[PDB]
RNA sequence: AAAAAAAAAAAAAAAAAAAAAAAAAAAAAAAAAAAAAAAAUUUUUUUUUUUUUUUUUUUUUUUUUUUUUUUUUUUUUUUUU
């Protein structure tokens, strides 16, 4: 299923989100690139055991509710790349990286915090998931000292 | 049998005045009613024309990366009749 340039931003409070994909399981690959998405609300990929890949590229996405991706235990392949992503948060991406592939989340506005990335620089460290040009697109935004600096040459040390 | 004067009563009819009332018609003044035309405070709904914000489809233009064919400007080491 592909709905690539279809502007479904708003439908995800129009008298209530339209909880799309009820009962989808036998479908693979899910891409939904470049629709300005703004806010995903929670129990929006339920019953999506069998679902691969997710494709929410060139949107803009900063609010990751908890607990998104639920029944994602089986994806292969995430992309987010282009996007308003700020922080990534263990208990919103956590199912879908226990057994990722491929990872794609470039030219974010990442921010090099203690509270923001200290999971993902972690998971980073200790993963194999084939990610391309990780070091160079992954540059955080803020803060001032931290702007324009590797993703992956980040210590954390200091947090936990 | 008839005709007249003082003095006291009673009966029919006509024209009057005052009082107690009762009906019909006509004038106002109050208490209400049913309406066909009116204005004036508040909250909402439909439609037309236009303002602002956000997200995307088509077309056009600028810059950068990469790939394929032609005009080719050159060449170093060689071969060559």
């Not at 629709?35 to 339920?46: A, M, R, S, T």
């Not at 019953?47 to 609010?63: A, D, R, T, V, Y």
């Not at 090099?112 to 070091?135: A, Y």
Request: proline share 6%; aromatic share 12%.
């Amino acid at each position: 299923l592909d709905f690539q340039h279809n502007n479904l931003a708003r439908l995800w409070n129009p008298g209530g989100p339209v909880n799309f994909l009820k009962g989808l399981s036998h479908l693979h690959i899910l891409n939904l690139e470049s629709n300005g998405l703004d806010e995903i609300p929670v129990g929006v990929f339920k019953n999506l055991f069998e679902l691969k890949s997710i494709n929410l590229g060139l949107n803009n996405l900063n609010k990751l509710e908890p607990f998104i991706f639920d029944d994602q235990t089986s994806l292969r392949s995430l992309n987010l790349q282009k996007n308003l992503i700020t922080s990534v948060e263990k208990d919103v991406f956590g199912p879908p990286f226990q057994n990722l592939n491929s990872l794609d989340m470039r030219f974010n506005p990442f921010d090099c915090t203690c509270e923001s990335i200290s999971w993902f620089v972690n998971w980073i460290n200790q993963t194999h998931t084939n990610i391309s040009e990780l070091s160079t697109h992954y540059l955080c935004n803020t803060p001032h000292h931290y702007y324009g600096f590797p993703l992956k040459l980040f210590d954390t040390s200091s947090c936990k």
